[PDB]
Subunit: 42 residues, 3 copies
């Protein structure tokens, strides 16, 4: 299965509550993006 | 309980990300639904 | 606003992944629900 492609770089955003995974595919501008919780620990 | 992710992949046909875990035989994964799209 | 990840872990007891973020005092995380399982 060649469909799953590596993630080049993972970032997350506490304003939008999303993480964005840049993908090793095509022109470089495809991303995976999902909803996340974000909070300060301790 | 939390274990390191050794590798992360995402799939634009199934719309999932799969994280390979550093645990046991090396064949455990975490997997979640994701959006996938082209930016710009 | 998107910041880098310094460590990525997942947990098969709590069914979450956690990404420690490079921001502020260093204690901020992103955390989301995931499936976890052994393949094979
Ligand atoms: C002999 C031995 O030590 N064996 C080890 C195993 O015990 C261990 O497996 C984990 O074991 C614990 C019990 O000790 C399990 O915890 C229980 O889980 C049940 C079921 O949980 C599901 O359903 C409940 C209620 O409906 C939900 O709240 C849960 O989230 C979960 O449901 C899942 O939720 C996700 C996220 O939303 C969904 O994607 C998913 O589809 C959904 N699944 C289903 C079927 O609905 C719960 O009722 C009990 O109260 C209790 O919490 C735990 O489930 C089980 N984990 C797994 C992944 O099977 C394994 C794995 O070890 C763990 O994961 C590793 C990656 C690592 O992080 C390790 O540190 C963790 O402890 O290891 C065995 N030994 N080995 N190898
Ligand atoms: C922690 C590794 C367990 C590996 C699972 C096996 O199938 C046994 C081996 O070949 O060693």
């Amino acid at each position: 299965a060649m469909a799953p492609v590596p993630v080049t770089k993972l970032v997350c955003d506490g304003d939008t509550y999303k993480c964005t995974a840049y993908l090793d595919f095509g022109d470089g501008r495809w991303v995976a993006q999902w909803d996340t919780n974000v909070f300060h620990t301790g």
